[PDB]
Enzyme design. Structure first.
Site, mmCIF file in Angstrom:
data_model
loop_
_atom_site.group_PDB
_atom_site.id
_atom_site.type_symbol
_atom_site.label_atom_id
_atom_site.label_comp_id
_atom_site.label_asym_id
_atom_site.label_seq_id
_atom_site.Cartn_x
_atom_site.Cartn_y
_atom_site.Cartn_z
ATOM 1 N N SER A 1 0.994 -1.642 -0.092
ATOM 2 C CA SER A 1 0.011 0.008 -0.286
ATOM 3 C C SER A 1 0.995 1.176 -0.545
ATOM 4 O O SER A 1 0.555 1.962 -0.338
ATOM 5 C CB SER A 1 -0.728 -0.092 0.868
ATOM 6 O OG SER A 1 -1.922 -0.708 1.031
ATOM 7 N N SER B 1 -5.576 2.968 4.347
ATOM 8 C CA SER B 1 -5.263 2.277 2.857
ATOM 9 C C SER B 1 -6.987 2.084 2.435
ATOM 10 O O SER B 1 -6.373 0.482 1.320
ATOM 11 C CB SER B 1 -4.000 1.701 3.325
ATOM 12 O OG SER B 1 -2.693 1.134 3.496
ATOM 13 N N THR C 1 2.450 3.218 5.454
ATOM 14 C CA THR C 1 2.688 2.183 5.427
ATOM 15 C C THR C 1 2.384 1.267 4.259
ATOM 16 O O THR C 1 1.059 1.710 3.237
ATOM 17 C CB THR C 1 1.567 1.791 6.535
ATOM 18 O OG1 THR C 1 0.409 1.814 7.077
ATOM 19 C CG2 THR C 1 2.025 2.348 7.719
#
Ligand SMILES: *[B]([O])([O])C1=[C]C2=C([C]=[C]C([C][N])=[C]2)S1
EC number: 3.5.2.6
Length: 267
Positions: free
Chosen positions: A46, A107, A212
């Site tokens: 991601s 995300s 992240t």
């Protein structure tokens, strides 16, 4: 010598956690501050969602997109981990900016796939890497299959050094208008998914923003920037640790954050 400590301390984590760790820290111009396996290829997972938002902001900056444009979709666009996309499904749309913010800060996979649809798919994301000078990062597939991280598979990969230089180019290298750069910095600081990763290993007065990634086969990554004592840095951390639990993978990336911090404080 602080460089040997950095190397030794990361090798210690790799050995003890059965992990491969790739790190690159660069200054605003992309000059290397430190690295560890910096040219090994890792699955982006991601982390690409941050460059994807940059691509979208550049199109808005250029007048070829508008942040309030409504993007229509149905239940077919809801894939695994699509929390915002599912909330907006009954209304039938998300705007470009809603999708970008959910992609970067939650995300959200369906919102990411919505933006890929509008820009012309993985090939377009790759072309944007190439445009900004990154000849290594490549997007091949949409989410979630791009996060498969099958060993040996070079699809959907970057290197720590290429991605750190891409972060530096987006934030410090004039890829975006002053306005858009500030916004994307603000979105990265407000990311909701990084509290247990790199940020958890950095001093609490550093200004940090990051994106992240989590992949199958034990990948856990974090890329972004930090401002430490009047100096700016871009950082990319990619890790693979198939034998760790999910909590332990967060802890590993926080521990890499602490090893980074010791190097930075030494200089
Ligand atoms: B990102 O690419 O790192 C991610 C891919 C997935 C996330 C959460 C859940 C799933 C399940 N298909 C994929 S985050």
């Amino acid at each position: 010598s602080e460089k040997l400590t950095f190397k030794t301390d990361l090798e210690k984590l790799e050995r003890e956690k059965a992990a491969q760790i790739g790190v690159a820290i660069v200054d605003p111009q992309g000059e290397i501050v430190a690295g560890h396996r910096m040219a090994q290829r890792f699955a982006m997972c991601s982390t690409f969602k941050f460059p994807l938002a940059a691509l979208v902001f550049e199109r808005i900056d250029s007048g070829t997109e508008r942040g309030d444009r409504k993007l229509s979709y149905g239940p077919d666009m809801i894939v695994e981990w699509s929390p915002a996309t599912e909330r907006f499904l009954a209304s039938g749309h998300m705007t470009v900016l809603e999708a970008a913010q959910a992609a970067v800060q939650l995300s959200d996979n369906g919102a990411t796939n919505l933006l890929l649809r509008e820009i012309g798919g993985p090939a377009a994301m790759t072309q944007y890497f190439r445009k900004i000078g990154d000849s290594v990062s490549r997007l091949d597939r949409k989410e979630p299959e791009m996060s498969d991280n099958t060993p040996g598979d070079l699809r959907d990969t970057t290197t720590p050094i290429a991605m750190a230089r891409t972060v530096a180019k987006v934030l410090y290298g004039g890829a975006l208008t002053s306005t858009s750069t500030h916004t994307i910095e603000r979105w990265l600081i407000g990311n909701q998914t990084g509290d247990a990763t790199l940020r958890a290993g950095f001093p609490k007065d550093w200004v940090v923003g990051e994106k992240t990634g989590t992949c199958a086969n034990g990948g856990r990554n974090d890329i972004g920037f930090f401002k430490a004592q009047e100096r700016d840095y871009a950082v990319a951390v990619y890790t693979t640790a198939p034998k760790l639990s999910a909590v332990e993978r967060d802890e590993l990336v926080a521990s890499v954050g602490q090893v980074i911090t010791q190097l930075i404080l030494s200089t």
